[PDB]
């Protein structure tokens, strides 16, 4: 289809004198479970897309989605939040310093209709609203709402794949029961629920009477503040982030940044150890317990909303 | 140069004077990378693979350490999970009285079993062709194995030993420069096996002068009275799908019954939808312990030196 | 002739020869007896000249040094010139070859350690008819320089007109303080090096005060010549790179640099053709009196004794 | 385009014509709105750039000024930027033609003085011919520049990502002392000039303070911006002879200069090789805070308000 499925693809200048670009990277058109491109996922949710190739013992491999968070180990506070909750979202995000269209998209993502109406009224106060700004605002709102219904299981018809269950509190997942984490998860918007399911791979992957443990400890948490990149115990995971993923904005915003460096040649060591299969460090998002029922359609190509 | 085979199991040669034998050591056997075992022999005997763990900083510099992924299935239990058996249970874990001679001699030397290797000599001496080839080949195997072990044994005459590194496997008191039960068991090991554990098992924490770099938030191996084992200090074992094809066929005649796992259903369309994204490997690396680098150190040194604990 | 004190660093083993990296300033007959490269490497200071101008036409330059201590650094990492009772801790002499250790021991008058080095080198084979005369050359050169800067050496002409009080309270009263006592405790070469690196905050010449800075940037406490301000946080002193990277290339060290992000080139061009005010931290402390009749303008080092 | 506020300065009577000797930098959009020549002549300050370096590769420049007040000068001779109350006393407006007086009165918001100058010139029998147009042109240019630098002008951009609290102390976090209110009383152009000339002692970039000087070399008091250290004797500032503008060629000079008698060429040529540490007195005072969200590296000067 070559259709931009990224939710943030509708960003546009509400004023009809400046034309705005479309930095959504190639993956935006790759119709997958994600409804956001890797560039926007990096810039707004501090996550990078990846695939988890689970293998069986003989031939057959199947790949799930996963994300690695880009939170530095030395960060603290609101800087560790990957996906803020509705309460703290307006504080974690600097919505004031963003294009009005992106703010509208964010307000819709968290079901803050009051903010959307405030933006609409503010834009009405301006001149030129009736002719062009109204049309562009309506187009952005329509696209965003359409994506949200696509990812919201509670929409007319909207077939929902209730074959497989997902929890974020393993304390009672094997009992089919949930914790507080999955309650907070249910509080989330459908689009954000799907995004969390895509980004946060389940630490356990019970399939028909078969448990597959992928990690021995979760790397993310679901707390009141939202989906956070803090280990459940001990110092934060060393996550060295370079300027590649950064893709910083505001070329005139002077920002200080404490960055570590390794002093030493390391070239002879690199040459000596080269040729081995490198083990990637990163930090995948592992948390919870996913149950795949005996009867199910789990290799379904087209995305279907998953409701617990 | 790079024409000397550093793998300890390279010397394996049939003691009999007729049947030849060429050990299938991987090319990596020829690199002086601190490993004194090749990747294929590591897989065959210690059930581990050889990987490199690259650690980057925020700037344009990086450095690589060694790490290994064990090849123990989640369903395995008992003495099948043991990667590196201890000096006592090793003869019970390995089936030494099946892998003919030579390799058995190397294994006995690796665990400092003088009596067993002497018994091997006693049995071999009665052969008709002893003073012929047999004695030469046995002596050559012993010499090569002893040289390999001295290269790693820090308590060898004029054996330079690095001491800017401190490695622990107990963590609870590693911040206080003190190890524990796991470290005590580790010290009992042979020098070659101590180096092998240091190479294979990457530290959970890495503390350079003062900055602590945490690589994993939970150890994946353990050092218990039975040795270095691939059991987590938690509930069900990590799902490790053994690549059956990759693992050598060993004995074509021996009939082994293996209950393999099989995923069912078409998955090519899913791969097409998820083709292009960087794949996060599902291997199980060996993470455990705490490694400290003194402010004054020669960590980025090419030549291997035994890293004896202070 | 190389006058850097650290010019004699060699290898006591006969095969490997090591000509210590010395800046071209080593050969100058300036008051310094150390080169800029070695001053940076060991005492973490960079040499500069402070020019003082009259009103119409006459400029005379005094010496000065800027320290290279980051504001974030704390503790024993702030001392530039350690005192003789703590230097073996601040300096990691153990990892400093042997000739450099000998020079450092001589600088601080640690004859015991020098003799220990002597014994250690006598035990080894190939010392008598080889390493001997090499350790001797190192010791002879080091002692020659130290007695050159030591005012008490025999028939050593010593200047006495000019006075230097690192405690400014009673300097106008012709008297030092605790810092000045600690300064007197130092070795002659170290006293000269301090008097060179650390410019005086005040300059009383012909009874005329010429206060240069309004606050000292260093302090002479027990630990030594500390690069610490005696008020509030430390001075922002960014040091970029490529000064001591000669450090053992296999020594893996972590460094917490502080980078600025954003395009500065438009702002740079906006204000480019302006005289730039340097952002280094000079070593200002104390009081210096010229004492009317004197020979301050003499182009040859003479030991200065308070 | 001449941005200097004193650029207009045209003889009100159509007569012998002179152009103000504005320096080349008058044609730079550096945010000074004053040339170095006029800055020196009137506010006894010299322009300079303070480069702040990061640890790796980046450096951003910042404006600064060095005052030209001799240490011996006292009283109203030490004031660089007089307050709106004492300026008619500090400045000899009487001996400043008339266009300079007009500009200065506008700078200090003295519309009464402007009106009396205008009326005195109205009484001229040859007023409406040519003087009215030139007077109005000078007024228009001056008012336009002041509006450019006045944040309260109609729909005028005013950035508030950056906070400049003088007299630091309690002002560190977010406060502002008596000096801060005194500064607030100034005109927008004068506030911009002070903030351009007086670099901040501290610079907290959203978490990280960058102390640039131990003590302030200037102070904001009731008399105005003063070149006086709050620590005792004034800083030695050897203002040379030639660099001073020879405005009045007939005024009797009488100037007590300072001289350094003695040969100094040997020392100069002995130590010429070393990097020189400038002896100018910059203007350090206060505390500048940069918020996490900011446009500080953005050119196209915007008036900054507290
Ligand atoms: Zn996008
Ligand atoms: Zn091998
Ligand atoms: Zn030198
Ligand atoms: Zn001008």
Numbering used by the authors:
A (entry chain O): 13 to 320
B (entry chain J): 12 to 321
C (entry chain P), D (entry chain Q): 15 to 320
What did the authors write?
Baculoviruses are a family of arthropod-infecting, double-stranded DNA viruses. Baculoviruses are insect-infecting pathogens with wide applications as biological pesticides, in vitro protein production vehicles and gene therapy tools. Its cylindrical nucleocapsid, which encapsulates and protects the circular double-stranded viral DNA encoding proteins for viral replication and entry, is formed by the highly conserved major capsid protein VP39. The 39 kDa protein VP39 is the most abundant component of the nucleocapsid, with homologs in alpha- and betabaculoviruses. VP39 forms the capsid shell encasing the nucleocapsid core.
Here, we present a 3.2 Å-resolution electron cryomicroscopy (cryo-EM) structure of the AcMNPV VP39 protein and its assembly into helical nucleocapsids. In our reconstruction, individual VP39 subunits pack as dimers that assemble into 14 helical strands and together form the central cylindrical structure of the baculoviral nucleocapsid. After local alignment, we estimated the overall resolution of the four-dimer reconstruction to be approximately 3.2 Å. We find that the VP39 monomer comprises a distinct mixed alpha/beta fold, which includes a putative Zinc finger domain facing the inside of the nucleocapsid. The Coulomb potential map reveals strong signal in the vicinity of cysteine 18, cysteine 36, cysteine 49, and histidine 52, which are positioned for tetrahedral coordination of a metal ion. Based on the nature and distances of the donor residues, which occur most frequently in Zinc coordination groups, we placed a Zinc metal ion at the center of the coordination group. The ZF faces the luminal volume of the VP39 nucleocapsid assembly and is surrounded by positively charged residues, consistent with a role in binding viral DNA. The intra-dimer interface is stabilized by the 75-residue long lasso loop, parts of which protrude into the adjacent monomer of the repeat domain and wrap around its antenna domain. Using the PDBePISA tool, we identified four inter-dimer contacts, which are all primarily mediated by hydrogen bonding. Lateral contacts stabilizing adjacent units in the nucleocapsid (square symbol) are predicted to be the strongest inter-dimer interactions of the helical assembly (the theoretical total gain in solvation free energy upon interface formation is ΔGsol = −13.8 kcal/mol; obtained from analysis using PDBePISA and defined as the difference in total solvation energies of isolated and interfacing chains).
